[model samples]
Structure formats: structure tokens, C-alpha cells
Target chain A: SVKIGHYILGDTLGVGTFGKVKVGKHELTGHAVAVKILNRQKIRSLDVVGKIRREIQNLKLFRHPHIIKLYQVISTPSDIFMVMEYVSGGELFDYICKNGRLDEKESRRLFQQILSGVDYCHRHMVVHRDLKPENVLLDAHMNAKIADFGLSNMMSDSPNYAAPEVISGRLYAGPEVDIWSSGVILYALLCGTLPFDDDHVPTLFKKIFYTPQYLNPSVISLLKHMLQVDPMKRASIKDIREHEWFKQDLPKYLFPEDPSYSTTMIDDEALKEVCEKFECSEEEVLSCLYNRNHQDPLAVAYHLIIDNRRIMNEAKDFYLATSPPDS
Target chain B: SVKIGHYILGDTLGVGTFGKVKVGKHELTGHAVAVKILNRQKIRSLDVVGKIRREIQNLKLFRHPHIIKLYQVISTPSDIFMVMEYVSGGELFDYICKNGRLDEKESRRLFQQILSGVDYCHRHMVVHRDLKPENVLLDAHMNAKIADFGLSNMMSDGSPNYAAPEVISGRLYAGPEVDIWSSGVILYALLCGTLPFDDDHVPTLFKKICDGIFYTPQYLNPSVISLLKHMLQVDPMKRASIKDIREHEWFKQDLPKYLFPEDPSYSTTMIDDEALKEVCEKFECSEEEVLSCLYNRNHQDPLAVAYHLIIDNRRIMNEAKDFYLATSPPDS
Candidate 1:
């Protein structure tokens, strides 16, 4: 009963540079989330205030199934609580650690999801500059979702996953940096190791200058687009989806874009109520429901009803926990 | 800005059976966290509602660093939110996958931490029915933290990979016994990247586990072999408490005590990041900085050429983090 008005605080989800991330639970319904506590004194000194705000702003605006959704936010005078979607599979980095490199099928499957998500970000003009496996999360299905928008800005310092352009301290587009990082990710997934490794700049620089003994040839060729030394030559998110390797389509993932799923299904009555909202015809609504694999007219119509209700709330509006601090 | 009182939800930290977990940040203070959302519909259908509640009830009672602490539970009409500690490094299963099985030192280094957590659970009369590398998480330092108390109960259907034969066969047994069997399996799996029992042949695997049939690894320390034998002892009444498991003749043979000190029981990795940084001068900045430094040094032996091995301090200074290591591997 140690509830904080609407939520209860739980365990340390993790420890970061500033403080520990604790778990929180909502009271009215069984909503599980993480309550991230920050030491007020540390925020100002680290100059992380901007970084923190930038992350909140960026995450609040983006919405996609492949992206981790932000739910709600709450706070007290000293601490802050973020009620959100709780993913339990843990970090993809750890998954690599336990399993060792992923098979091409699995890697391709996950990579596609990553591309889909990052592409969505790119479309929104948001660049996830930090796109390593650690920042990419796996849902229970082992599906990938992009996380960690805090370090996605231009001012972010250089990291190993940065594209060659970013590493050389040259100006580069955000998409290129992400593409480079994804290339590194792809290399790691396929090779059970890294494509570019060497702490010593001179040594590693010299090594990559030489030909890399890479994973199966199929991946290596597709990989070139990602690891291309020049940002201009690197693969765009669009190019990645069209690659030969990614073309191996799976039946289930075929309709990944259909919006009539989960809560979006509608019934006839719902169609009448909501068809005017999105300003769509009943036929279009039925087609969406059909594409989602719904059979009954009533189910499809009601699907629109719930879909309409959900759209009324709109995931973008409902998922922001809050950019808190009252004022 | 949307408000959940005062928190901002970010990307996901992970996903679980009950729901998808997203990253949650504080609204005012601006802190990051792992938020787990349990779907009411899924949990209700799984018939593990009571079991999950039981886990929450038990998790609230423990505060050991080795155990994943459950901070609080919040219920909205459609979901249950559990805010928890976010360990950046993921499950031990992934660690082993990347590192390919562990050496005696690394295996023992991590196993001790698992036992410490398990012993704590046992002391509290709780049993982790599902104990595997996947269920065991390694933090930044590679310290083992037992996770998933919620799935530990209803998981008796026995994936067989991690479950004890007694539990899997549906034979009634005490919680402590089930855990001991799992510890043995984890230890064997840790020593070699392979499971002791194979599911490719289910009947044989079942018979082997039930009959206490398993292989003694030539690659493993003789002492480790003995420890595995004792823990895997099929007798539920084997009086094979963690005490006996600890006192076994295997542990006595020159296993390095200093590596995993008695109190912290894991490695010095358990020390807070700043404190651990003191242990390794190169760790003064982000771990990435140090590894970036090590990458060049280890590679010039140039380019790690280690088995898709990750490039890390362990590869450089022989200083492993959170008990895992890597090679020519990038600092993932």
C-alpha cells in the first residue's frame, strides 16, 4: 500500500550515470512501469538537462509498433515516476552475449524490424544516432524496438558505433550515422564479433584498411552498403529494405503495416460512429479489417469502433508519460 | 506534455510474458528507468494470475543486490506497471552466447553470485523454479542478479532445458530441491556452452535427467565436475542444501577465493561504477572509452581475430566486466 497517489514504486530497473531506475506499478488498473529516480543535485552539474528534455520531446512525438511506447509519467517533490510499457526480454546486447551471433534468418528478421523502426524515425526527421544493440530492445517475441533517444542528437559525443564520418569528426547526416551503427550491429549479429575492432586507432585503422574476412558472402555484400566509408555512399533506410537479403519475406510479417490490429478492429456500428472521424468509407474500413485477417462483418465493424476509440485517444497523445516539473 | 503524474515513458528496456517493458524517465528530475507493463488480458488467460501475484508479494520482501528488486506495483484498468532496476547488461544466456561457454574462473566467478542469490531465496523459503542463464542477469560488472520470480512458479510445464526433473515430471518436491537441480543444470551449461541434457531426443533427455545421467566434462575442472555431480544428485532428500553444496570437496581444491570474495560473494565488479573505476584506472570514463582504448591495443596483436569475440577490457587488461569476456569483438 506504499502507493504514490496513482502508482507504487518498485525495484531498481537499472543503475545509470546519475541514479538507479526503479520499477513502478499503477493503482487503478494493473499497469506495470518503471519509476526512474534522479538526484536533483546531479542533473544541473552534468548539463544533462537539455539531453533529458530532448529525449522526452523526441520520444513523445514518435509512435510505431516497432518503437517502445511511452505510457504515463508521475512525480513527487524529490522523485519522478514514468509509467510505461514494460519489456522483459532485456537488452539485445545481452541476448547476443548469451546466444552468440544470430543466424541470418533471425538477424534478418530482427534487422528488418530495426530498419522499419529507424526508418519511421528518419521519416519524422529524428535520427537515432545511437542505434547499437544495447539501445535496441527485444520484445517478448524477440522483435526489435528502438530505445534511448537521449543520445540521438547532434551534440552527442562520438562512440564506437558512430559512422566513419562521425568518427573522423566530420559533418554527417543523422541517417548515415544510424546506418553505420546498424552496419556494425549487422556485423556483430552475423560474425559473433565486430567487423571493426581495435582500441588502438593506428592499429584498427590499419586493419579495416585491409580486407575483412567477413561472415557468409551473402551478408557481406549487403553489408557493404552499411559499412561504406563514405556517408554519401552508405545505404539509406529505404535502400536497406530493398536489399536482396531482406527480400526473403515471411508470411506473418507481410502485413506488418496494416493498422487494423490489436485495438484497431471495428464492428458495423463502430464504423458508422468512427468512419466520419478519420473520414474514411466503410469499404476502406472493411478492407483494413480484412487485411488484418478479420472475417465477420460485425467483428470488422466493431474493430473500427475500438480502432476509432483508440485513434480518438491517438497513441501519440496517450503514450507520453509527461514532460514533467509542473510548469 | 502528457502526464502520468510526474514521469515520462521512453523506449523499452525489455519485454516479458505479461507485457512489454518500456524505458521510463522522471518528469521533473529526469532519471531513466525500466518500466514493465503487464497486460491484464494476457495474464488472465495464462491462468498464472495467482502465481504472478505471489511473485510480487515475495519480491517485495527481499532487498539483496543480487536479486532483481521489485520497487512497486501500479494498476490501471488495463495493465499492471512494475517499475524496476534497469540493468544495462542483459541476461547471462546472451553473455554465454557471445563469450561461447566460460572458463572455470569465469564460470565459478558468476556461479557463486547465482548461488548467493539462490541461497537468499532459499533462506526466505522461496524457490526459483526456472533457473537458467536467461533468468540470471549480469549487471554492468557481470554480477549475477536472479530475475523472473513471476514466471518461476507456473513454469513447471518444464522447458526441460532449465527445470529440474522432479518439477518437470510433476513429482511433488520442496522448493529448495527444485532450485538445487536447476543450479546444477546452470553450472553445467555455464562450464560448457551446451546443456547437459539434450532436447533433440526428449525421451532420452528425460530419462537421463530423471536417472541422473549426464556427462563429466574433460574440459572442466575436476572439482567443478564433482560439484555438478553433487548438485545434480537426484535425491530430493539428498540433504544437499547449499551449505553442503558450498562445502563439497570440489570447492576446497584451489578454486580462487580472492576472485569471488566471501562477503560480496561475486567479484569486485559489484562495487558501484565509480568505486569499480578505481579498481581499473582506464575505466575513468564511460566503459566504451576504455574499450575503445583496448580495441587498438588488443587488435594490433592487430584486430582481435577472437571468435566473433567482443573487444573489451577483459581482452585488453584481462579485466572482465560483470564476469563476461570477448575477443576481436566490437565493444558491444
Candidate 2:
């Protein structure tokens, strides 16, 4: 048997009512992996071990670019260990919080990718119950991947894929909950806030049902249909894929035009004129123009103008002739 | 300034849609604390920092034996930190699984303690929005403490303590609904499971207000009436107080006997067979005692036996076991 210690368990990744996750390194590959260990006693108590097993089974069968990869299951006598692909980057919430609201193009791009992932799950008859930002990870390339299948349910048993009201907390229909959650995520991306508050379970429902409007008119309409209180009225995964929003504009944002077009060329006199706008010393302006060709001329000139403006603003009373002694 | 390296900052304790809790420790005290760090950007974007602050304010103001303690707030430029007391014994759900269903007396004792805690909060006009098993923690002594006031709300303002149905989708109710939810917790404890059927928002409200027969009178009646009454009170302010409940006749039934048992040792062995038989013999009772007695007798065996006895002859066995277990142990 391989020595367990070969894989060094690092700091814990997360914990919950069911189990805890830790960051560990594989001995053979030296690759980082997330180890989720669920307490058997707790699972048996909740009588959700069967559901958890089903989730595992479904996860093992699913494979998509935007879906988190579940590598293997390591079952111990006391706990069930699930070794999964470790997304080095933190939650999408971190990036969103850093950057206020994403513009429409960016939101559409990220959301379309999410839908693609959810669509794949739907195609396989899988419904992810918990689909929030925390469960979505961004790779180095900022690609969104759905994770955490612990609360997922498969719809193979029922062709219509109707989840019991009790299981869904009477809030959503099968597969529809995923759409509603996706809408919530989209709303958060656009408005930078949760659409519903957790004051009470009913109040949460009311917020989703009553206030159909969110960030933009079109977005709000879509969100309203997605979060419809009546599960029957909610949009299905296929309907979401067929929506006009996805068919157009999503691909453009995901892969934008090359940056060189806007950065490569610049007119010499124009660059000099831009530098002169800051009332820089003639010597400094000449030096900036000379260095322009060494870098992306337009980009360098833009930075020069921005820096000059900031300096001028900071030294409102300084004499232009003095040229603000070189820092 | 104190250096910050003493405590280990391990993986997150929990992560939800809005927040994530990490395990941290005090640099000097060496005490393990759960640090709930809210993403500042997310908080600002959501415009619910006010709500989160309100929750922290209520938690800070709350001081009861059964309520979890919110120690302090550590705010930085990038994140908001809440230093909370850590309950290492784990969730109450774990305890319930270990010891099937608690007897009526045991349930009452625990429920009374929980009531005292919640009653204290309601008296202060605070409502604990999320009160579930996962949020309830058990100390090493098995003392129940209400925790995770992340969704708590204060009704000091004239605004309704409960959210309106128009404001949200799920069930809506006043402050008493908090207690009603706790009553649900009590029901779960008694039945050893959650309510079987799921009711929609409207139907749940209908059951709460109109359907008087939602629960069986035989299973829940005058004994738990005050609890249900206080919990299901329509008006937020009209709910019963811990002080008022202390005076109820139900409390007097076996308060000192159970809460502050005359013989502490008796409470521990109440579940043991030899001790139970002794008590039955002293009372001159035959194999057939009260229902609680029978429940206790059967409960003393392995879970397989208890399950079998509960299924075979429920009436006689339930009465004998329940009664036998209810009485104080022989020494007392």
C-alpha cells in the first residue's frame, strides 16, 4: 500500500455540517488535490448517505470543461473521502468583490459558460441543488467551473425529473432550481448583491417572486422567469439554452479582439502634443517622445498623459517652468 | 502591538452564498475561535451590510445560558470578522443520532432550556431568522446553545418583526414564528425526524393560523400547549416570556425533580436497566408500567431491539417503557 503520509495534508479548505475539506498534495504526482471527508455517522443520522452516494455516482459520470472534476473516492471505515481537482484560485466572489459589477458583456460571457456547464448536467439528467458563487471556481484563465456535487440529485428514476417538494424545500421544481440559482448568480454579477435576503424562508420566496426587477430590464425579465415561484412556470435548462441572450453576444465577450490594434501605432507630433497637455518641461516631453517607439507607442503615450494629469492635479500651485524636479 | 502568529488559521469552517467562516485563534489567549469573515466587496455590492451589522448587533446584545456567545468584531479594510465562541462538541443532530429519540421528560428538559434562551431573545425584541439543528451546538456537557445568528433580525423599529409575504417567497410570520420554528425543532427531537410532509408557503401559513388540527391532539396537547401557544402566538409581543413560562404548572410538574434533580445520579441511570427495574420494584409495578416506562425499558437495549419492540406491541411497550423511564431513579 502507498504510504498515506506521502500525500502531505495542508491547511483545511472548508468545513460544513456534513464534513470538512482539506488541501493536500499527492505524493506520486506532487499535484494539489482537495480532500472532502464526510462523517459517516452524520450522514447516517441525516439519512442522506444514499443521496450522497447518488451524487458521487452522478459526479463520476459527468465531464465538461466548466464542471469540476472528481478524481476518485477513498472510502475509510469512519468517513467517505472524495479526492477532487483543486482549483488553485479562490471563489468568484473574491474577483467580483474586487471589481464592482461586471459590465453586460462580461456578465454574459461568464454566465453563458455557467449555462453550458449546467446544460451538460441537465443533459445527463443531473440537478445541482446548491449552485452559488462559492461552489463555482475560476481557473487561471478565469473559466467558470461548477463544483460541489454533495447536494446534487439525479433524475434517472423519473423521466420527467420532478424532485419532491420536500427535497427542494417546496421552493423549486426539478432542474428549475438550478436555473433559479443561476439567475441569482447572474443578478449578483450584474448588481453585486443577493436578490433575496434570508430573513425568513417565506420572505426569501417573496423577494424572488414579488420583485422581478434586478439590474437591467432584459436581465430582470429573464431572472423573473427563472425565479418564478411556481416551479411549473419556471424556465427549463433547454429553454435557457435557447434564449436569445445565449445565441448572440456571448461568444464575442468570451474571446475578445487582439489588444495590439489599439496599442501599436502613434503619430510623433500627436504624441508630443499629448505630452505638452500636461505642461511638462520641453526636455521631459522630448525624452517621452524618444522612448515612445521602444514600447507600445499609443499605450505608453496614454500612460504618460494619465501620469502627467495626476501629477499636475497633485501639484496645483507648482510652477510649470520648475518642471517638478525629477522624482 | 501584539504579534499575530500564535493561532493557526486553518481551512474555512463553513461557506455559504454570502459568507465564509475560517477557524482561527487568539494570538495570546490560545483559544480556538471561529472567525466568520464576510467579503467586504460582496457585502457592499449586496447592500446588506446593514442587515449583517444588525445581525451582529442582536447577537452582541443577546446574553442567555442557551444562546451562543458573540465575543467581538474585528473589522479591517478588506473584510469584516466576527469572533464567535466555538462549540467543539458538534451539532445536536450528531447527538440525536447517537441516542435515538429523547423521552418526553428529557425532551421537556432540553426544550425548556432552549425556550429560556429564545424567550430571552424575544423579550429583547430580537428574532433569530435561522434556527435549525445545524445552527444549534452542544457543549461537552450536552447543553444546547442556539448559534449562527447570521440571519438574526431586530424588531426595535416599528417595521414588522416578520417579513411580509409580499416581501419574500417562503413562509412569513411575526417574532413568535421564531419560537414556532423552535417548536418545529422540538417536534423533530420528539419524533426523531423532520415533519414528513412539505407544505408550500401559503399552506404552511394556513396550517399555522387556520388549521387547528394540523397536529394530532393525542401526541401534542395541554402538556405542550403552552409551548405551542407561546411559539405560535400571532403577535410578536404577545408571545410568552421565560419568566411567565417558569410559573406555568407544566414547569412545576417535575421541574426541580428533573432540572435540578434531587439525586443527580438518578438522572444518569434513568436509562439503565438495573436502575429502572429497581424503581419499578419500589413502586410495586408489574412488567406493565406507564408508556414512558416501557419505552425506557426497551430503549435500554440495542437499537435493533428497540426498533423491534416499537413495531411489535407498540401500545403496551410504549406505555410501560415511557412511564418506567419517567420516574426518578431508585436512589432519588
Candidate 3:
């Protein structure tokens, strides 16, 4: 019924403590986006303004394929509008619950995407601080796009995925805690249920030091390394990247051998359009895009156009590739 | 000459690769600020736009007494203006260069502040990939406020080659050890007024840094030398963590209680009623509203911001007085 900038708001997608998330469409392009309409007064009263502000700040900076893209933030005096990439495939948690234990290869593919996202975040001095199936959303293509960056300094509400150190109220520097959560998520994927679950809190904590056997020896070895209660002794992102289990069938683009190469291929047409629309030179637009300057509107438009094109092509590719050859 | 936001631009405080840092003052508060004027075209051409951008992003998030505070950022299409804390005491590099070797106690004081900043950064999931005397600035009260957060990623600019032994070996590294190694070099420079490894040729220098062979002055205590050896260890596995250094006997002397608080939650919960009243009076907000906002940790709110600024300024005043008294040598 209402519009915020280029996007016309539609039916509500979800609701949270602060406000509602509505599905929206670009006025001209008709491209889809998820708009989180956060009530300023509600956030102010709840004392979550900083938390909300941080989410906006962090999400705006990120541009990885596996991380949910934040295209624009339009603020009114009363509310904050976060225009983000719309994913129709829903939460990874729902998918797993319905499917009941993904196949090894499928799990590997999803896990790889999640790790890739986590790697990008760590390299950029961000620790997601919380990593679980519910926080990881899949696109139409079932590719993982990590979401929910509001809990950078907060304890995880879902203690099942929290690291032992986190539970013990010990100070964690950053990455080690997230690695522990990833290990728990990986365990959940392999087995339909949690590795450690009980009605009793003490018993649940005690049982966390345990896992399964039908899994490959390589994965078993990884789970053991990751699940180590001692944070310093736990496997780091580097160690996981180098692990034999993790190395197998890893996408070259996802884990580029030489990181200098641009994995997010740019469209010349879209690039030209961005220059024209922004009234800036090719060099200016390119530099802005290259730097991932989300603060600039020019870079944001270019990305939206490129992502839309990629998604359309991916849909076509999926259909043709999966379809049987004509007789 | 020009104005941005409430800050009236003044004389050049310093010059950097991206832009000129000028002294500026708030039109309203008349508080001093260092405004970094970055040219967009220059940054783009230099391919350091990302580098400059990272500096702005990281500095804005951090808020510790030992780290430089970014008050506001104003950007035009042509230029990005970063309004930051103005420290009259100048760079620690020049301070050390002028004074030569500092007294052991003085060195300890500065080193503790530097470590406190680094610990804060690490806790906040940031690694200040490059840390040196040049990067650490001193405030008017001789408080160390670590700045220059441009290189979050491991980019070897190779200025004096403070690169860790692990990095030089092409071995994989997590963030902290690199900072620890640089901190070691800084400590050495403080005690000796020169780098431990001084070969001009990088090949020899790299070898010397890797070999971890350095002499300690006889005047330097055995405890400090032992700490330095631990920090400068070639094998990062054996290298001391920030925790290890914090607990070191030499580092523990007259350690500021503010830096190592018993509980962070304790301070946050203990609201200064005077400060709360001041926030309500100055900001013209209801006392209940201010109290509720503070409890919620909504520091981005104008009222919350005002409250924190007042409280932090008060804390700094007391800390400065304490430091002045403690560090002042007794009358003969």
C-alpha cells in the first residue's frame, strides 16, 4: 500500500520485536526486495537502537554472494526501512526439518557456502557471533545466504548452538565461538537431530562433548576437532579450510586460489548504465563498485541490476540442466 | 577557512597519503577536532579508496579511552570529511624520537595503554594489522590513543618491516600474533630508542627478525627482557597472548584499574545520578526516558549519546588527575 523510495511495499513477510518485514518491488524495475520496517520509538523504548543501528551498519558494508545484500536504508523520523535481497526459499532450518537429514553431498554443498560466507566475514574483521540454521536463509536456488547480524556482542538465545565458553560466561575474542556453532550445525545436517539435547540443562551441557559414526572418517575427524571444548584447541577457519574433508569438491569461485581475481563477474551493460544513471565516469563508477562502497547509491544500483540478471540466468540454467534431452 | 557540520576548519594538524588532517573546532561546543579531508578523485586514482573507507568504518565503531574517537563523517561527491578526536600531544613516534629512551616506569605506563587499546580491538574482533609508535598518538595528558586502523587486512606496506616471523615464512596466521610482534618492537624502541633488528637490507633484516636475536640493554630489567623475548618469539605458537602480557610482573606495576575492570556490567549498571540529572536537564528529556534509554544500551540516540559523552568526559578528568599525581616524581 505504501512505498519507501523505489520500492513499493507489499504483504508482510515476517514480524520481529521492532517491526514488520514486508515483501516489496522496485517501482521501475519490478525487482523484488525484503523491507524491514523498524519502528524507531519501539526500538528506542526497547533500548535496541544500537543493535538495530549496528545491523544496518554491518549489513550495508557486506557484499558477498553468501551474505544477504542490503541495497538501501531509508529512514523516516518514526521508522527505519532496511531494503534487503528477497529470498523465496525461506530458512535453512525449515528446509532441514522437512527434508530430515540431507544427503552427504547436499550437506557438503550447503556447509561450503556457509563456510565461505563466514570466511569473508572473518577476513573483514566481523564475527557473525551467532551461526545456526535459522539464521541461514536459502535463495530460490537453495544457496545459503547468511542473515541476522544484530547479535555481534550478545549471547545467543539458542544455547544449543552456543560454544561452551559462551555458556560459561567466559570472554571470547571472536572466531572460535562461531566455529563451535558451525560444528553444531554440521552435526545437525548429518543427523536429523541435535548432537546434544535434553530437557535438563546440566545433562545437556554434559552431553555436548559427544557425535555419530555412519559419516565419513574425514568428516568425523573434522567434527572432533571443531567440537573441542577448549576454544584455543578448537579448529580455526584456516584449519577447516585446509582440512581434507573441506577441500573435497570445493567450488573454485567460492574458494578462489588467488583471491585477487573478481569472482562476482560484472556486466558491461549494467556497468555502462550505472555510469549514465549516476552521471559519473566509468572509472568513478568502477572504483566505487570495486571498493564495495555501499554508502554510494551508484554502487547499490549496479549490484541490484547485476544480481537480478544473475538470478534470472540461474533459473534458466537450472531448468535446462535438470531437464531431460528431447527425443 | 571552510566549515563542515558544526566544525570550523582551521590549520593543518598533519598530512597523510589520502588527505590533509586539519585542526577544527565545533561552532557550538568549541571542542577541538581533527578533520581529515579526503579527496575522492585522489583516493580513486590511488586505488586506496577501500583502504581509506576501512579506516572510517573501523574508527567509527570503536569507543575506548585508548582508541581515537570518530565524532562524525561528512561526505561530498568530491571529498569525505572525517571529524575525529584532536590530540595536542602529537605522535608517540616523535615523542620517543625527541626524548630518546624513556624511563622504565614511563615506558610501562605507555605500553600498558597501548596494550589496553589492542586488547579492546581484539575483543571487538578487529586486528590493527599495523601497530607502531607512529600509529599510537598521545593526548595532552600523555594518554596513549591508538589510531590508524586503515590496514585491517594483512597488507605489507613494509615500513620498518614489523611483519611477524610467521607472516615472513608464508605460514598461515590468525590475527593476534602479528600485532603482538609489532608491540614487541614498539616496547624495544621505547627502551632502546632504536629497533632491535636494524639491517637496512630487508633480506638480512627478515633473517634477523626471524632468528629473534636481539640484545637487551643492561639497564633493562630481566623481567622486561623475558617478556620481550616471549612477545618476539619466532614461533607464534609459543608467543605470549595479550592475557599473558597483562599478567606479566613488569606490566602489572601501577596498572590502571580502569583498563582492567573487575566487571564491565558493574560500571554499566552503576548509573551516576548526577550524570543522569545532567542529561535530563541539558537534553531537555524526561528523567525516566533517559534512565530507560541508558538501560536499553541505545547509545545511538541523541540523549544516550549526550549522557555517555558527559560521563566519559568526567571519567577522563579524574583519570588525568590521578595519572598526573602518580607519575609526578617526589620533591627532592
Predicted structure with the largest lDDT when compared to the true one:
3
Models, CA RMSD each: 26.5, 26.6, 20.3
Ranked by TM-score, the better of candidates 1 and 3 is 3
Instruction: Please give the lDDT score at residue A234 for candidate 2.
Output: 65
Q: Chain B, TM-score, each prediction?
A: 0.63, 0.54, 0.69
Q: Point out where model 3 deviates above 4 Å.
A: A1-327, B14-18, B39-59, B75-79, B125-128, B150-158, B263-332
Model 1 segments beyond 4 Å from truth?
A1-327, B1-6, B13-18, B27-31, B39-61, B75-79, B125-129, B151-163, B249-332
The sequence of per-residue lDDT tens digits that candidate 1 reaches over residues B1-332 is 42353556777554444556677776777776566776754443322113334444445535667777655666676676766666676667767768888877777767777877776654453333334545678888888777654434111111225457654442323356567777877878788887777654445556777778677768876767777877887766552656567777665445444433353222334223542344245323454443443332333221123311332333434343433332222220
Residues A56-114, model 1: lDDT tens digits: 44445345676666565555666544555566666675577678788778888877777
Model number with the top TM-score: 3
DockQ class, candidate 2: incorrect
DockQ in order: 0.01, 0.01, 0.02
Where is model 1 chain B poorest over a 10-residue stretch in terms of lDDT? Answer: B151-160
Clashing pairs for predicted structure model 3, backbone only: none
Q: Encode model 2's per-residue lDDT on A222-322: one tens digit a residue.
A: 77777665554666565565577655675543322322211233334445675566555544444333221223234356455545553343222221332
Estimate the overall C-alpha local distance difference test score of candidate 1. 0.55
lDDT per residue for candidate 2 within B96-142, as digits (tens), equals 76767766676666666666555555444343343444556668787
DockQ (model 3, Cα): 0.02
In model 3, the Cα lDDT at residue B11 comes to: 86
